[PDB]
């Protein structure tokens, strides 16, 4: 690893110093990692995609919708998470303006194993175009646990642009937790990346309403 833990600790220290004390903001500020990869071609090279689950959640309150069956909706009443049924999706009747409104409403979607087949048939491909596609859930697993999991998901997918960005966590967390999460995210990124630590163009740490800080 070219990046060192003490340098991460230092840069996190002035980042939290700027975010917390000097210029506090009313909204909670998310810490962002913005990466750019180097000597890489989206068209020819394999398009890497991967996901990791952070231990402490970056975004506790981000909106999630659960497409679900009878059992999934009844459990979602206990979870307190917004849900529309298969009958509701049939109501929608593949109308583009309303489904675009739903896609801009909800950042994340969780769907059942049974209904994940016809989620494209009822809804179409505009979810894949946006990049928000429903994540599978089963009857055995806990919905609120997987809501916490999806809220803690970090995903790197190549697409077409050679620069990516993820949300490591909040400003308000503790410094060692922030250092550990940014280190494991960089390690996950270089694990997905071929010819690791040399196709890394630039790594940037930032806070929401904050200046950029360059880690190599």
Partner RNA sequence: UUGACCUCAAAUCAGGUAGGAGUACCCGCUGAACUUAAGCAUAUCAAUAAGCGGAGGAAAAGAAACCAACCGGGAUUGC
Partner RNA sequence: UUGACAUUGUGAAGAGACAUAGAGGGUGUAGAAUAAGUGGGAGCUUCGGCGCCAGUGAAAUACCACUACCUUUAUAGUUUC
Partner RNA sequence: GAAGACAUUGUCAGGUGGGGAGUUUGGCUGGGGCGGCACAUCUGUUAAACGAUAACGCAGAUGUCCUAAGGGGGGCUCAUG
Which positions lie near another protein, rule CB under 8 A?
46-47, 49, 111, 113, 116-118, 120-121, 125, 127-129, 133-136, 157, 160
Tell me whether residue 114 or residue 208 sits nearer to RNA (CB atom): 208
* Structure letter (DSSP) for residue 21: I
List the interface residues with RNA, window 180-199 (CB under 7 A): none
Choose between 92 and 165: whose C-beta lies nearer to RNA.
165
Helices H / strands E in the chain, number of each: 8, 10
Toward another protein, which CB reaches closer, 133 or 213? 133
| Distance, CA of 89 to CA of 105 (rounded, Å) | 15
Taking the complex as a whole, how short is the minimal distance between the CB of residue 123 and another protein, in angstroms?
Answer: 10
For CA atoms 92, 98, 100, 106, the dihedral sign is: negative
Report the distance separating Cα 19 and Cα 172, nearest Å: 9
Selected binder of RNA within 47, 53, 94, 100 (CB under 7 A): 100
Q: How far apart are CA 179 and CA 96, in angstroms?
A: 42
Residue 48 token pair: 């890497």
Distance CA(28)–CA(207), nearest Å, equals 10
Q: Quote the tokens at residue 37.
A: 């990869």
Q: Report the residue number, 70 or 130, with the smaller CB distance to another protein.
A: 130
CB 83 to another protein: min, Å: 17
CB of 51 to another protein, least distance (A): 11
Instruction: Write out the H or E segment, with its range, that includes residue 105.
Output: helix 96-105
**Chain residues in the site for RNA (CB under 7 A):** 23, 25-27, 30, 32, 34-36, 38, 59, 62, 97, 100-101, 103-104, 107, 126, 129-131, 160-167, 201-202, 204, 206, 208-212
């Amino acid at each position: 690893s070219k990046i060192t833990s003490s340098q991460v600790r230092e840069h996190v220290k002035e980042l939290l110093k700027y975010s917390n004390e000097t210029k506090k903001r009313n909204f909670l500020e998310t810490v962002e990692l913005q990466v750019g990869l180097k000597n890489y071609d989206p068209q020819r090279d394999k398009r890497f995609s991967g996901s990791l689950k952070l231990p402490n959640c970056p975004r506790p309150n981000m909106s999630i919708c659960i497409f679900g069956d009878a059992f999934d909706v009844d459990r979602a009443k206990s979870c307190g998470v917004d849900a529309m049924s298969v009958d509701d999706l049939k109501k929608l009747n593949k109308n583009k303006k309303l489904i675009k409104k739903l896609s801009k409403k909800y950042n994340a979607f969780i769907a059942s194993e049974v209904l994940i087949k016809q989620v494209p048939r009822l809804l179409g491909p505009q979810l894949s175009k946006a990049g928000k596609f429903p994540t599978p859930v089963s009857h055995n697993d806990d919905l609120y646990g997987k809501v916490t999991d999806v809220r803690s998901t970090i995903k790197f997918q190549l697409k077409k642009v050679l620069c990516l960005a993820v949300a490591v966590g909040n400003v308000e967390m503790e410094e060692d937790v922030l250092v550990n999460q940014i280190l494991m995210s960089v390690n996950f990124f270089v694990s997905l990346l071929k010819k690791n630590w040399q196709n890394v163009g630039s790594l940037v740490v930032k806070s929401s309403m904050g200046p950029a800080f360059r880690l190599y």
